[PDB]
Structure formats: C-alpha cells, structure tokens
Design a protein around this ligand. Sequence first.
Ligand SMILES: Nc1ncnc2c1ncn2[C@@H]1O[C@H](COP(=O)(O)OP(=O)(O)NP(=O)(O)O)[C@@H](O)[C@H]1O
Ligand SMILES: Nc1ncnc2c1ncn2[C@@H]1O[C@H](COP(=O)(O)OP(=O)(O)NP(=O)(O)O)[C@@H](O)[C@H]1O
Ligand SMILES: CCS(=O)(=O)Nc1ccc(CC(=O)N2CCN(c3ccc(Cl)nn3)CC2)cc1F
Ligand SMILES: CCS(=O)(=O)Nc1ccc(CC(=O)N2CCN(c3ccc(Cl)nn3)CC2)cc1F
Ligand SMILES: [Cl-]
Ligand SMILES: [Cl-]
Ligand SMILES: [Mg+2]
Ligand SMILES: [Mg+2]
Lengths: 352, 352
Amino acid sequence: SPWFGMDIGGTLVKLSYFEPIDITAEEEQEEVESLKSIRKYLTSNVAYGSTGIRDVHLELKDLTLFGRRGNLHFIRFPTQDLPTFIQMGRDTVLCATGGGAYKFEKDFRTIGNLHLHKLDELDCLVKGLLYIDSVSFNGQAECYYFANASEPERCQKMPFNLDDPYPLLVVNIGSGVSILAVHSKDNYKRVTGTSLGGGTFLGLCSLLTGCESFEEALEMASKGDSTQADKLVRDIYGGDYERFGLPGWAVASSFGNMIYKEKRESVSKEDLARATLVTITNNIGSVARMCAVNEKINRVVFVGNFLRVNTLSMKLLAYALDYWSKGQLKALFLEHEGYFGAVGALLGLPNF
Amino acid sequence: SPWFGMDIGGTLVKLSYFEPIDITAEEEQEEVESLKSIRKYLTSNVAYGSTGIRDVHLELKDLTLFGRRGNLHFIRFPTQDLPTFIQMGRDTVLCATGGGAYKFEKDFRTIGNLHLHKLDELDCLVKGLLYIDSVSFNGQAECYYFANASEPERCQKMPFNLDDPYPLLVVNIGSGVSILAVHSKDNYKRVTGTSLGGGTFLGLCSLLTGCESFEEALEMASKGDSTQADKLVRDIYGGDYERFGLPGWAVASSFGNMIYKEKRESVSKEDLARATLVTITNNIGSVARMCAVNEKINRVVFVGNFLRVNTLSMKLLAYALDYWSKGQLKALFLEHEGYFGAVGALLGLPNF
Ligand SMILES: Nc1ncnc2c1ncn2[C@@H]1O[C@H](COP(=O)(O)OP(=O)(O)NP(=O)(O)O)[C@@H](O)[C@H]1O
Ligand SMILES: Nc1ncnc2c1ncn2[C@@H]1O[C@H](COP(=O)(O)OP(=O)(O)NP(=O)(O)O)[C@@H](O)[C@H]1O
Ligand SMILES: CCS(=O)(=O)Nc1ccc(CC(=O)N2CCN(c3ccc(Cl)nn3)CC2)cc1F
Ligand SMILES: CCS(=O)(=O)Nc1ccc(CC(=O)N2CCN(c3ccc(Cl)nn3)CC2)cc1F
Ligand SMILES: [Cl-]
Ligand SMILES: [Cl-]
Ligand SMILES: [Mg+2]
Ligand SMILES: [Mg+2]
C-alpha cells in the first residue's frame, strides 16, 4: 500500500505522497505491479490528466519518515475533478482530511477494501506545519518574511527561524479563512474565521472581469490600479485624517468610487481585479491583526493556496501588518503553504 | 443667523436645523427677510431641489436648546450635490464636521463673511449620540434592539435603555466603517475600522446588478437568495462542521460558488444583490464582535445610513451577533442613526 495524505478542500485537493528510494531488490520483486505502476506514473509525470499538477519545486528529498528514507511529493488538482480521481482508482489505507473527507466518504469506499480514516483539517494543519518546518526545506528555512516591508527599495525575502514556534497565529486562507491560535503541539484553538477568502477573490473577479483562472486573475490584478475603484481617505478629506492616524492613501471604502456611473464606465477590468485582490487581502490582514492583539501573539503566519504564486498579496500583507501594528506584528510565510493538511493526514498513518 | 449643524460625509451630507417656535412679535419684525425666507423654505417643503430630503418622521418637537424652545429637523442630500447647495447659499456661523468640512472648506468660504468652524466627525458623533438619547425621541426611546433575534417568530423591535451608556461600542457604517469605544463622555477612542462598508455594498451592487439607487439595491436583495452565490459549510463538508461549532448553513466562502461558470450563468441579479448585502453585513458584525470581546464591551450600537430603511441588515446583525457570541453581546440600533454627527456639530455652536 502506498503512503498517501489527502486534504480534500472546498476548492482544491492536496495530496502528499512518500516515494521510497531505499527499495531493496527483494522488496522490488514483492512489489505488486499495480503498486509499481502507480509509483512510476506519479514520478514520471508532472501533469496528471488535464488538471493534476505535481509541484516538483516543493519536493522534499531523502526524508526519513516512518523509519524509511524517501522523497515527499506534493500534488494538487481541483476538488471538482475528484470523481475522475476516484474512477481511475477503481481500475490501501487513505488518511483524508478537509471537508471533502466527510462529504465524499461514501465515494472513496467504492474503491474495493479501501480503508478511509477521517482526520480534522486543523489538527492536520498544525501537525503538518510543525513537521515540515522541523525537517526544513532541503536544508533551507521553511519559514520566511519580507524584511523592511515598509520600504519597497529594501523589501526582500529573508528566512525566519521557528525552532520554538509557540505561540503562533496561523491564518489559513483557502476558500474561506480560518484563524488558529497555536499555544502548544497539543493546545491550539480556532479563534475565528471569515468568509472573505480566496473563493471570494476568484468568485468576484470572475463576475467582474470574466477571468477564467486564478493565475489570469492575478495577471489582471498586477496590471490594474485599485484606486480607480476604491474611495480613498484623500477622496473624502482632501488629504490625511491626521487626528486618527489615517493616511490619505488608505482605502476608506472598497469599491466606493463605483457608486458613480461615470467611474464605473471608465474603470478597467484590471482595475477591478486589483481592487478585488486589495479588498480581500486588506480585510484578512486586519482580522489577523485584531486576533493577534487579542490572543497576545506577535507572530502571524499565513498559509493556504490564495497566496500561491501570489507575491502581491504577500507583500501587501507584509506592509499592512507592519504599518498598522507600528512594528509590533510580523507577517510570516511558508514555502509549502498549501500542503500542510495533506502532510498532517499522512503523519496519522501510524495511528492506524 | 440660523442654527445649523452639518456633517459632510464621503457619500451624504447630513444637516440638523433648529427651528425656533417661541418667536415673539418683536423678534419677527427684526427677522431679516432672507432669514425668514430660509425658515419658510425649509418648513414648507419636504423635498429640496431634485436630491434634498427632509426626514420629517425623525423631527424632534418642543426641544429646549440653548435656552430656546424649538423643533429639530433632519435633512440629507448627496455630497455630490454640495456645489448646488453652496451656489444657492451665495444668493452666519456654520459648524461643520465630517471629511467634507476640510475638503470643501474653501468652497464654504465663497459665501460672504460665513464663519466655518471645523469639528471632528467622531467627537460630534459621540456628542450627538448621547444628546439625542438623553432628550429621547419625543418621549419614546431613541435606542432599540431586536428581542429574541434567533427566533424569527418572536423577533420584534423593543426599546432599550441607555440612561448610563458606558461602556459602549459604536459601529459607524458609512462609506466605510469606524468602530469606537466610548468609555466616558470625555474618554473615547477609535479602536479600528474597515473599508468594507456601505459604499462597498452600493459599489459592488451597481457593478453586479446595474442598480441605480440604494433603495433599489435593497429591493433586489429582498427578492434574492444569497446561497446561490455563496459557498456554504454544507457545500464543503456535506453538513455541519461539528468539531468547531460551524453549522451547515454558515457561509464558508462569500461569492465562492461563482468560481464555477455554470453557477455564474444561472445566478440572478437579486441573488448577487442579496449576497453583497449578506457579505458586507456579516463581515461588519464579525469585526464588531471581535472588537467588543477585545474592548470588553457587551453593548454594540450600529449607526450610519447603511442601515437606513434597511431592516434586512439590522435583523442579520441582530441574529449574527447573538448567535456567534452565545448571547453575550447585544446589537443595538438608534432611530436617528445617520444624523448624530450633524447634531454634535450643532451642539458646538456655543463654543464659538
Ligand atoms: N489552480 C487554482 N485553482 C483554484 N484556486 C486556486 C488555484 N491556485 C490558487 N488558488 C487559490 O487558492 C484558494 C484555495 O486554497 P485552498 O487552501 O486549497 O483551500 P480549500 O481547502 O480548497 N478550501 P477550504 O475547504 O475552505 O479549505 C482558491 O480560492 C484560490 O483563491
Ligand atoms: N440615498 C442614499 N444615497 C446613497 N447612499 C445611501 C442612501 N441611503 C442610504 N445609503 C447608505 O448609507 C451609506 C452612507 O452612509 P453615511 O453614514 O451617510 O456615510 P458618509 O458619512 O457619507 N461616508 P463617510 O465619509 O465615511 O462618513 C451609503 O454608502 C449607502 O450604503
Ligand atoms: C473551517 C473550515 S471550512 O471548510 O468550513 N471553511 C470556512 C467556513 C466558515 C468560515 C467563516 C467562519 O469561520 N465564521 C464564523 C464567525 N462568523 C461571524 C459572523 C458574524 C458575527 Cl457577528 N460573528 N461571527 C463568520 C463565519 C471560514 C471558512 F474558511
Ligand atoms: C474614519 C472616517 S473616514 O471618512 O476617513 N472613512 C474611513 C476611512 C478608513 C477606514 C478603514 C480603516 O479604518 N483602516 C484602518 C485599519 N486597517 C488595516 C488594514 C490592514 C491591517 Cl493588517 N490592519 N489594519 C484598514 C483601514 C474606514 C472608514 F470608514
Ligand atoms: Cl474514520
Ligand atoms: Cl475652524
Ligand atoms: Mg483547506
Ligand atoms: Mg459619516
């Protein structure tokens, strides 16, 4: 039986797979042809079907897991295509997490004698996060931040040490947002969440701009000017609102300039894409800061696939957190930001 | 000189006017014809020009202000039409607040010998709020709440006593949102704010539905089904997420179902209007609860014109606050919710 870990979310399925590379000549003969055909299929291809992708750059190599040396692979595909995934498998213990582990439980059991063990999506998130940072990213730091995030000529990616990670505020930006307070490896809680997450960005951008992919929405946003749609403090006061420390460039009302018909007719789709990104990202950063001040935690780490290949939101979260906290809070990011639930599920295999 | 109080916001201008009704026969002769023509113009009409409206139902009668008995009137018009207002006035001390008091200061001074005194929009908000509740709404309570807000067959408007209003969390929903912690009549602070306010609802709804007025957007929203656009917890888990107390009906991702092309093509404009309202209202309620728990305040009052003739957002704020706080927080509302800044400005007249 292959060693899998699966996080079936509302939007994407994340899969962690451990490829053994210490296979002996005796183990290779005892390897069932269906087991060997799966390993060759997953290691010989980087695209699976029309929608499966292996993030090769994130692969952890020569990892010692469960007493075996092997490579840890990271694979993703849309939850919409899970029926295809299950149908291929109908032609083994699966530790599955996320909402889809419960919603599609009966569908997984159509696979003969498959044992499905459901694990909680936030248990696996914490366990997977702490594990990846503990084994490092092939010798490099798993955690990083943007140094001098307020100065763009100095803003640069720098490693960050999490050798004692407690306390920690984890902001999981998926379809929605979950915010966790991690006080210990066995003591964490979900402080709150918001429904304004990555699905809101992709959903609104599809309605406003007709974009057909997450990557295309980011590409439109990078070319836009969000101030064409948002109403700023300087649009209301003529400048800064100095009494309450609000700079003139601060957004007073997201999409607030779209109450005027003349501005709706001159705004571009790139502007609306950028305004959607800024609106979602700013709100997430503000909620994270409020929870951090309440939980008395100064280290806030952002995970989830909304930040995948999304440097604009990361730098915006970095600048916003630092500016509005007066330097008291730090925005942290992880190289395997979308796969920690799938890793945590895989780590539950010995417990079964 | 007539007694005015003006709050020039990012979207609407709010005007409070004190009509003396204890005018003596001697004072009537000494009344300049321009002063008398203004009083007759404002008291004989409920619509001013094409965009001015007098909220007659909110008028306070037989109010003793500055040693005089009179009626307190409440008038509003779009900030976009302030040039018309100023031009009419060019054919008197004005206490003005809001962002427009600074942005349009030079425009007000085109009126001959007019003395403009700028006051802060949150000082006037606190002073105006405490004053109106202290003099009552013509004998009725200015403050009210929705009793049994979790049971729709029992949800009903009920008066609420604010005879000692401290501490108090004020949520000002205008173009954006400001959240204030009122510890005393001379001790209050702005804890935070969010750019997802009434301008976001009106701006997004105009882009998504082509609505041409705030009232038309509310009318579309009352006919829609927000679950056609939002992705729910039950869409991700197949039911409740019982481990973290998330019911199946809770919104997991606002507009999250709009990532699918087939659902974007079947959604109606009323559904998108309703989803925009629910999205803005839920986020405001969640931020209010987070600030209330942090500030250790259990009374949260919502003001601003986003809730004007908007019973859907009020009841949603009432149910959401009560449900997510497990009964610890109370959503409060005020009959003069949009005019407290204009009243507070008027009350600064003796200080000049
Ligand atoms: N290829 C992609 N397809 C769709 N969304 C993507 C893609 N790449 C990045 N994203 C973004 O990442 C978000 C989904 O992130 P993810 O962490 O996988 O959440 P999820 O687990 O699927 N949803 P949830 O059930 O709430 O956990 C999407 O809403 C997008 O904003
Ligand atoms: N007739 C209307 N026209 C426009 N908006 C309205 C109207 N009636 C209610 N509203 C809502 O009320 C909001 C404006 O409320 P308001 O409290 O007057 O804010 P503001 O002071 O003008 N903006 P701000 O500068 O941030 O204070 C609008 O964004 C709408 O959502
Ligand atoms: C968790 C994994 S998931 O798959 O189910 N996704 C998912 C689901 C829900 C949410 C939102 C959430 O947590 N909410 C609780 C707090 N809330 C409010 C609202 C009003 C008020 Cl006054 N107070 N609180 C908003 C809703 C985010 C998610 F990312
Ligand atoms: C005040 C009267 S106004 O006319 O100027 N209107 C007005 C103006 C601005 C705002 C928004 C606001 O207060 N913000 C400060 C807090 N913030 C963040 C963002 C990211 C992070 Cl990480 N942390 N905090 C978001 C912006 C609301 C308004 F209603
Ligand atoms: Cl199980
Ligand atoms: Cl002045
Ligand atoms: Mg997830
Ligand atoms: Mg205002």
